[PDB]
From a paper:
Bacillus megaterium encodes a functional sulfo-SFT pathway and the corresponding gene cluster contains a DUF4867 family member, SqvB, with 51% sequence identity with E. rectale SftX. B. megaterium SqvB adopts an α/β fold with a central, characteristic β-barrel and belongs to the cupin superfamily (cupin from latin cupa, a barrel). Determination of the molecular weight of the predominant protein species in solution using size exclusion chromatography-multi angle laser light scattering (SEC-MALLS) revealed that SqvB exists as a homodimer in solution. The role of DUF4867 family members in the sulfo-SFT pathway has not been determined.
Numbering used by the authors:
A (entry chain B), B (entry chain A): 3 to 223
Write the structure that this text describes.
Amino acid sequence: SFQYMKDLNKHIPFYHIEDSKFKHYGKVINEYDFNELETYMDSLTIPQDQNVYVASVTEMENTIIKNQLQEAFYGEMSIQIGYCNGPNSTLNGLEYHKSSEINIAITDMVLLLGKVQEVENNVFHSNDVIAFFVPKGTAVELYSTTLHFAPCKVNNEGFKTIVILPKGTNDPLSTNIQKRTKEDELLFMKNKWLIAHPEREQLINKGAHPGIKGENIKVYQ
Amino acid sequence: SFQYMKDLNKHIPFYHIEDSKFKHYGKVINEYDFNELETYMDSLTIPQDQNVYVASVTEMENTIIKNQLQEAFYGEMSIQIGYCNGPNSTLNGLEYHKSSEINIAITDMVLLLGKVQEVENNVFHSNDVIAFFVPKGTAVELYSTTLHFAPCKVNNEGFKTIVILPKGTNDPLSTNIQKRTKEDELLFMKNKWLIAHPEREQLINKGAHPGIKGENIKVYQ
Ligand SMILES: [Fe+3]
Ligand SMILES: [Fe+3]
């Protein structure tokens, strides 16, 4: 429940995804159903140790709805459908893509969002983050200029999310560039620029840029 | 010259592209060399009747700069390089992509920009447009949430721009979708959503949505 989560998280701006404060970050998508996907997602368990992210799942890609979303929402550009399920409750990191991402909440979840415009010399401040409570069943477009990461759990068992992007996004980089722009320092996976919190050893050890300044926010439930 | 243009366009909030007001719309790209493309552009004159947009030019794509922009600025996503040159001086339309576009000003030019978030039931108002004077040699990223169209001229002979996007963008739609979202009404080419001004009969005739309210803004020079 939203009010329970709201009450417990007075240390961060906290909104329902249907609130107009979301409008700068994304849009709620209403006119699609996702039965084919939900059927797949129900065959999956939530890991309790750490989040899993599969970028591209054939089963979910071989669907009517994938073809609908590709031709219309993505204007005929090739897409992948994956999932991010897990027990996480902290910010950890903030990433962007030069694309639209769809997140479909298969469980209640929360997203910690920023705006890429608020990055200055590869630094973003926790204070700028906003949380949005997304109910089971809700689908959102997150804009390319919206800093985002893995959801934070609402229910004790964790969360389940469908994640839709241009095909190839989050694949390993296949070249090692000559870095020349500020942004190049963030480049981490295909079509994925990442700003990690310095207390997130799992990302820092992977080479991620340590540019979140402030507390690694925690979402209490 | 910027002050010349500014003095003639007091009917429109008018800014240098280096101004901070641009930060909401895009970013200036500095650390790249576009010389190979500049050389191709020198082989062209400016059309005098009407704009020309060619989405993909193989010769421009078979360059070192194309490989660099693909691997780094687009994070390994496949890109096309084209150009948009001509004599235009009006708004005419506002389009977006679920991608970043790069515009490289080979001549002085002006961009009339909006935000996608300012669209309300498939309507944008001219009064929300902001003009940005882009000097010869400036490269800009336009974010996916930035409504944009073809440049407006500074010099009497017209303008020349390089246009970089994900490969396929602005190709003809291969499907006729069953429309279901407000956004589906705007879908006009591959990865291109357009809101046309009603005075451009040629766009409306082709099925563009007439949703710009207000003057077809003109840039005087
Ligand atoms: Fe993402
Ligand atoms: Fe465009």
